[PDB]
Amino acid sequence: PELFLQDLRSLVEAARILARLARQRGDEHALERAARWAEQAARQAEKLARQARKEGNLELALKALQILVNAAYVLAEIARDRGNEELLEYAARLAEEAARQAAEIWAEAARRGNQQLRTKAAHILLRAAEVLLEIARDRGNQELLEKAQRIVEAVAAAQQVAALALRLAEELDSEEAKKAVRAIAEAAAAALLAALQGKDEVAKLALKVLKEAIELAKENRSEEALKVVLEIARAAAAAARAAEEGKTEVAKLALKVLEEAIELAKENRSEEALKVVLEIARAALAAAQAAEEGKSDEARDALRRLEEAIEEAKENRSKESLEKVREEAKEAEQQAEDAREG
């Protein structure tokens, strides 16, 4: 049970001893035996985590990482002394595919409404990226450092999106607010998986778009703006499925489609201009399912339609032309219905 979880922690703390003890004894017979006391151990937890994540059980699969994550820092002191990069590039795959399912845990954290666990996942991601640090604290994998500095940057700022949620479910103890906050966070977890892939600038600017969402939500908070930011929360969310589809050319385009809209929020802040912005986003949630489908020449065919219209409200913002970008926003929202139907 959970006794076998504490029955495995000592085995890990038995490799950190026998590996440091057998490297200091010339016992490469026991240093290869202590290097086996860690390889024979970490797998029994990876199958335990795969079966716990299969049962939809969080708190145990969460405690299954902090023990399995530390298993790298012991195999680091082993494969560094023996010098075998075939046993060092083995802990590389042991940490990359480990933090793999660590973010799929932080998904249903906000996607199901657990807020004290979406901040408990950051420990693993923080204390597991530190397994590549001391692995290259002096060594040097130049391309690997270009990830942890773009990964650890994608954790601390990711948990920062969960900060305004609390300070807005506490500054606004409402259900029309704690539903957006739980979904404007269920939409912020995608920025993790969007900068955790090669495109680090795609999601650096993805959360940067959701940044102005709360700033335009604390400035003008309507019951039609709580749903304007919420219909834009889970709308810019799928801009990662466009970046996670080669279409970072269309995702960094799609994620930017809302930037000038959230900028046109507190300038011409009208209940008729909000419902034109609050109705302008829904196509992005359909154009992202189209760049997660493959129509980059049809998403950009519909994306190049709201550009001269982005140069419409920008050029012509007066009451009859921002309300003409209203009958033009409805026309732009029709290109998605002509594309979603396909």
Next chain:
Amino acid sequence: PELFLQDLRSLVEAARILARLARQRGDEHALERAARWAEQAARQAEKLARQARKEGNLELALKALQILVNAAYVLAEIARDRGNEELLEYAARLAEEAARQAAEIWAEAARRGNQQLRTKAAHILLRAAEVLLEIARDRGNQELLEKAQRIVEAVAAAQQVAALALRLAEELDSEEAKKAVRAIAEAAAAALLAALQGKDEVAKLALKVLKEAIELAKENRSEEALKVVLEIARAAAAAARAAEEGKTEVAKLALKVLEEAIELAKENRSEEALKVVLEIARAALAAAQAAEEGKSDEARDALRRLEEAIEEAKENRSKESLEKVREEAKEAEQQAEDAREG
């Protein structure tokens, strides 16, 4: 709530990564960004601790230190590598004014009767002085080491005064004993703030006076001696407000006024000599409020009155002259009433 307390621990463990990761990448853009991930974090807890200590809430403001105390050991590895002593002398004020309110927590620990927390405060003071150690483990601030060696010495011995309290509230499970023990400890916390200021010898000998209190309390423990040591417990207490008033010349004099009295306790141990010692102390609790007032030429005017009387019981100790230092102790106790009235 307390979720934002765990939502801040990961942010600290995210600076210890990104600062060690960006110093090892030439990213003084991210090493100045990781040096900001710690500066933007520690303040949100210092205001949380100031608002928790404002509400009279212990256990949360106590857990607010162990996270805020560790914040120094991360900024140490930053300001040491960059070499900027304008960012290193910033963590100096971040640790000095931090342990500032750490002893004001241990005050109401015994001053309100919480004994398992007066020993929980020592962790912070011990694990926060260790933030100056690794900051100068090789560097070297010679004047700063002359504090931590006089500070850490003032913690371990301070928590030693709380040891006899337990072993006397357990060796004497009484209320006439657990009230003195809770006040002979509420009087021992002042020795912390008296050696934590420049005068390290003032309180080294202050607890050394309360040392013979329990030794003369385990030797001759009367119900009139439980109140003799208790009327001397919170009496020598205010000898710090004299040292914390420049008058370490009058405090180290006032703290020494009880030394020869506790020595005259188990030699001429009489219920008529106890009530002459048990009535000799109360003037010190009034002469300390006078050296905490400014009458160093009037406290020493009344202190130089019990000196030839200290040379009275010492010279003339026989039954008619220790009982003549009785009608002289009452005369000495009258100089405080002529001084307290002012």
Next chain:
Amino acid sequence: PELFLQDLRSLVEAARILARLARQRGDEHALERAARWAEQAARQAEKLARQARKEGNLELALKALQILVNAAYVLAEIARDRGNEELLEYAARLAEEAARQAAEIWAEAARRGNQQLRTKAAHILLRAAEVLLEIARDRGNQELLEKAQRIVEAVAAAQQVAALALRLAEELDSEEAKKAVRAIAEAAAAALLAALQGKDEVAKLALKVLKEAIELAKENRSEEALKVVLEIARAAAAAARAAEEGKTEVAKLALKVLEEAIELAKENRSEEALKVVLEIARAALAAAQAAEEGKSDEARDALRRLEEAIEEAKENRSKESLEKVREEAKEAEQQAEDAREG
């Protein structure tokens, strides 16, 4: 109470500061004072552990070790800098006689049926052997390393015997199984004390005999084989009291008396051959009390009787000669009754 247990943890963390602080200040007056803040502390717990182990209280005497075990790693940084091997060979006796009673705790763990604590004891043994590592991480006590590499090897494999117990009290949730499992573990704790003494090969092969017990128990598990392995569990157990009696010549002989029997288990697996093996072991539990008595010329006189009979079932295994090693096993079991009576 347990407040004095937390009132002692800070005192330990006050030596690790003042010893590192006074060695870095030339204060060999305070470095000898910090070396006293640890010597005056560790004994108050060793008497607390001796009085807790006297009261048969586990969880507190278990938490009395993790604090007392760490006390070595602080005195290591002291006696290494001062260079005095008369203060370094003092922490040697402080760690050897410490792990002394650490295994006598893991005894009644399974010998009384507590399975989640027999795995909690491994932490101490693992995190206390690591006190000799950093003590000789660079120094070098060649004969001492020949112990910790044979001690830490005797912990991780010892807790491995407790693994099959869970995976057989969970794979077979029975009382005829959870009684053997609690006794085939109460018999595995002796292998700890048998390789923790000079004879490291005596118990390396002792658990190696109990290894084939479960392998022959998962292959052919009868209700007469659950009692065959259980009557062999606590039978090979006392093969340590023979090794812990100089008679490692008779113990490594006695521990090997069951090897060829567990090998003759799944080859001629008969309910009439099981009850001949299940009745062949009981003499070992009586021949081990004879090598724990001193009759090495009478135990080997009875041990040299089952050798030509070991060369009987091996030579003559057919149905009439393994059943003739049946009427010979009863004859061999009679030499113990003629020896136990003495």
